[PDB]
Task: structure prediction
Amino acid sequence: DKEPSIELFIKAGHDGENVGNCPFCQRLFMVLWLKGVKFTVTTVDMRKKPAELKDLAPGTNPPFLLYNGTLKTDFIKIEEFLEQTLAPPRYPHLSPVNKESFDVGADIFAKFSAFIKNSPNNPLQEKNLLREFKRLDDYLNSPLPEEIDHNSVETITVSNRKFLDGDRLTLADCNLLPKLHVIRVAAKKYCNFEIPDHFTGVWRYLKNADERDEFKQTCPADIEIEKAYLSVAN
Result:
């Protein structure tokens, strides 16, 4: 058939130049990249929305998708829609086969959000976050139901999967990786917190991510993330 005209709008951030901090905006950015379809990206300052954003602008939030002249909102509706409209024949299927891959990377941003919100509770929060990281690390270390090798007599079997679900990026990776980036930048900057290196699984996971352009090149500048979280430390 024919090619769709697709435009993705994401928060500009800071001076209206470069891309701003929005994990869900980067997540949609990665999804369209993995699909391989032809699309364009626009950095949009919130104060002066461009002409195309005139009619549907009450308080609508940064991730915007303009598809074939039709505006779309709610990035969750957008994610499945792109997966639905981009069919396996001509485009990949990024949905993960195991639901746990989605579930491990869910509350971690919430546990971080309470942590980075500067507050007296600290060590319980950091331990709360560290437990969430170990759950991610323990899940990443544990082999999936596709790679157990039941006959193996090896005492120790440690998974070597590059990413969350398989050896290919998935929607769970698009959700988790932008959130993980914000966690590292903001926490080290404002809370002097680093993911402990003894968390071999998640540290391995982050290393494979930076080796791929789809994640690293869609990341906002470090300064953009820090400035959004300067206020929350008040």
The CA atoms of residues 182 and 225 lie 7 Å apart. The chain has two domains: 1-95, 96-234. DSSP finds nine helices and four strands in the chain. Residues 96-234 form a domain with the Glutathione S-transferase Yfyf (Class Pi); Chain A, domain 2 fold (CATH 1.20.1050.10).
